[PDB]
Amino acid sequence: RHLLTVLLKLFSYCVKVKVNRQQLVKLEMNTLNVMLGTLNLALVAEQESKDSGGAAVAEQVLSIMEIILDESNAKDQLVMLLDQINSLQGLLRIIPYLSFGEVEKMQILVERFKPYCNFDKYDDDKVFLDCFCKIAAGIKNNSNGHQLKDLILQKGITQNALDYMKKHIPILRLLRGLAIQHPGTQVLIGTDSIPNLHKLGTLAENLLEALREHPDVNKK
């Protein structure tokens, strides 16, 4: 415990150097993998033993991993990952990184979230839905990211929310989250929701603006 805390403090001090950030970002370091393994060990320690100090270590690991991911911006274990996730948002961001593997695990999480998609039931399930919206916001613009976006479109929960809103014309969170790098979703939104979206409501305006990145959508 003490050695781990000291090493964490040292790495925390070290990360504050952009040169150190670049040096660590070197793939030869494979730092992100080591960090993920350490985070998994810390998660095991915290879940098996709450108040064992693993929480602070996990927070430090999350901050460091976030810094490393920002610097980079310049799936079997994902089972246990989502399991721990059941018990902050940096974990949601990390989930896509581990999701750059077997799309079977991607569909596993897609289904795990699809359970909380009972719209009339929602209006734990709310917590899962909010987490799903946050992860949708966290959808990365990658090849596997776009593949998973197309897969989630095939999941049709988007169409489910579309039907729910259409019946409920007087929610947009995951819509705006998926509104990035999903031209098919842009077309689906602009097909008929353009009138109702225009009729509105701040979140609706924000989602409409996000979809307006699509040019034909902005035309409407």
From Swiss-Prot:
Subcellular location: Cytoplasm; Cytoplasm, Cytoskeleton; Nucleus
Assembly: Component of the SIFI complex, composed of KCMF1, UBR4 and calmodulin (CALM1, CALM2 or CALM3). Interacts with E2 conjugating enzymes UBE2A and UBE2B. Interacts with RB1. (Microbial infection) Interacts with protein E7 from papilloma virus HPV-16, HPV-6B and HPV-11.
Protein role: E3 ubiquitin-protein ligase involved in different protein quality control pathways in the cytoplasm. Component of the N-end rule pathway: ubiquitinates proteins bearing specific N-terminal residues that are destabilizing according to the N-end rule, leading to their degradation. Recognizes both type-1 and type-2 N-degrons, containing positively charged amino acids (Arg, Lys and His) and bulky and hydrophobic amino acids, respectively. Does not ubiquitinate proteins that are acetylated at the N-terminus.
Record comment regarding domains: The UBR-type zinc finger forms a pocket that mediates recognition of type 1 N-degrons. In addition to substrate-binding, the UBR-type zinc finger probably positions substrate proteins in the proximity of the bound and activated E2-ubiquitin conjugate to enable their ubiquitination.
Family classification: Belongs to the UBR4 family.
Disorder noted: Episodic ataxia 8: A form of episodic ataxia, a neurologic disorder characterized by episodes of poor coordination and balance. EA8 affected individuals have attacks of unsteadiness, general weakness, and slurred speech. Additional variable features include twitching around the eyes, nystagmus, myokymia, and persistent intention tremor. Inheritance is autosomal dominant.
Official protein name in the record: E3 ubiquitin-protein ligase UBR4
Span within the parent record: 4502 to 4780 of 5183
